[PDB]
Swiss-Prot record, chain B:
UniProt EC number: 3.6.1.8
Domain of life: Bacteria
Effect noted on mutating residue 163 to A: Loss of pyrophosphohydrolysis activity against both ATP and dTTP
Catalytic activity: ATP + H2O = AMP + diphosphate + H(+)
UniProt binding sites for ATP 2: 189-193, 218
Activity control summary: Inhibited by the MazE-MazF complex.
Organism of provenance: Escherichia coli (strain K12)
A single MF term (Gene Ontology): ATP diphosphatase activity
Entry protein name: Nucleoside triphosphate pyrophosphohydrolase
Induction: Part of the relA-mazE-mazF-mazG operon, there is also a second mazE-mazF specific promoter which is negatively autoregulated.
EC category name: hydrolase
Phenotype upon changing residue 135 to A: Does not affect nucleotide pyrophosphohydrolysis activity
CDD domains (UniProt xref): NTP-PPase_MazG_Cterm, NTP-PPase_MazG_Nterm
Length: 220, 225
């Protein structure tokens, strides 16, 4: 009955109102922990990780209520009532669920098959560039247009994947393995800190950067 | 308050008893996907802007949060309600190694930002935009090195392109956006767009009898929207 402390908590709470996006990618990573926990069978987590997941949805309950759209009990209206009871296209059956990079590469393959690709390397590359241009361009406006930045940050990732394809590599992996090499070195580095006894907030960035250097020229 | 009519049907549905085939046959390890799928529809709407779908949809999600809460409480771990009071207790009290415990599951984009926000909170990070960006550049160049040899070393090649990607998340963030999200959006805009060309190219009589046309209608759509 908490369920209510909780409604009466979402009415009432950065904080900020804000928005529905930025709201989104909080949900997303949240669902990701839920799933993480189930695979670890980690069950005490599971109880927080779903507080969390459930936290969001009270927002959407929230913000929705604030418009003609009718609020939380209503939410649990639809879903209730159900349980007692396009054209063409090369892009079909790409689950939405797929992660970003891989769903980008996947799309580009489709276009490729259907005859719609760059057909040499050069303008593939040309273009990562053109797009980095449009990104930095945006970024240094005296007043930034948040959207157009993000938009441009987009086009650049789709751009560079497209390069991953022409080189024949799979972008979602590559970067997986970059958090692998990265994750690796970095802990190498947390550890030779602690070997000194000093802390990791017991450093200056010079020391970090220079150990990190020690570290990577330690594979030859 | 319908919530209650909900918490139930769950009773009467995961019911020992009556029903059922098929809602009664679910572990956690298997609800898990439709939580993903739904989370994924739940943003489709708040990017499509679709307020009918979005009740209907949120509910199918609420519902998971409950589905777990039933099952949790069949093994007697906790009740939908304990779930409220975990958060209820843990919002309210805001009022009035740091790569441990970053998942794997998690997309490249999200986990490089995350890993990255992570070394940042122990200030391991770049201090100024300029040479974030530079290092992209630098890494691109690494890529083309790899990319041009008389004999390409495919392995090498992948790695250095790993890092191009990382670099570029290093930037997207720092430019204070979220890469995986920025990709999602771009992906959508594109997919929208081709789509159209495609419905343009069909309309287009028949052929039967390109490609620019192909590359042209594309740009002529670029403007159109
Ligand atoms: N096969 C292709 N041929 C031509 N262009 C392509 C191809 N694949 C991707 N592109 C890129 O070219 C298009 C134009 O790039 P751009 O970054 O200018 O986006 P835009 O919407 O046209 O303009 P802006 O980026 O300024 O909004 C994008 O849709 C992007 O996909
Ligand atoms: Mg662009």
């Amino acid at each position: 009955n908490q369920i209510d402390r909780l409604l009466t908590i979402m009415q009432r709470l950065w904080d900020k109102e804000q928005t529905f996006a930025t709201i989104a990618p909080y949900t997303l990573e949240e669902t990701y922990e839920v799933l993480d926990a189930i695979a670890r069978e980690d069950f005490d987590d599971l109880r927080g990780e779903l507080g969390d997941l459930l936290f969001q949805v009270v927002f959407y309950a929230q913000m929705a209520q604030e418009e003609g759209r009718f609020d939380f009990n209503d939410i649990c209206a639809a879903i209730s009532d159900k349980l007692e009871r396009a054209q063409h296209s090369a892009l079909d059956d790409i689950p939405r669920s797929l992660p970003a990079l891989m769903r980008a590469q996947k799309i580009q393959k489709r276009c490729a098959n259907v005859g719609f690709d760059w057909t040499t390397l050069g303008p593939v590359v040309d273009k990562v560039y053109e797009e980095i241009d449009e990104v930095m361009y945006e970024a240094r406006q005296a007043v930034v247009d948040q959207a157009k930045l993000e938009e441009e940050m987009g086009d650049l990732l789709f751009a560079t994947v497209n390069l991953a394809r022409h080189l024949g590599t799979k972008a979602e992996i590559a970067l997986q393995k970059a958090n692998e090499k990265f994750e690796r070195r970095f802990r190498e580095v947390e550890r030779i800190v602690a070997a000194r006894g000093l802390e990791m907030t017991g450093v200056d960035l010079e020391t970090m950067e220079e150990v990190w250097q020690q570290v990577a020229r330690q594979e030859i």
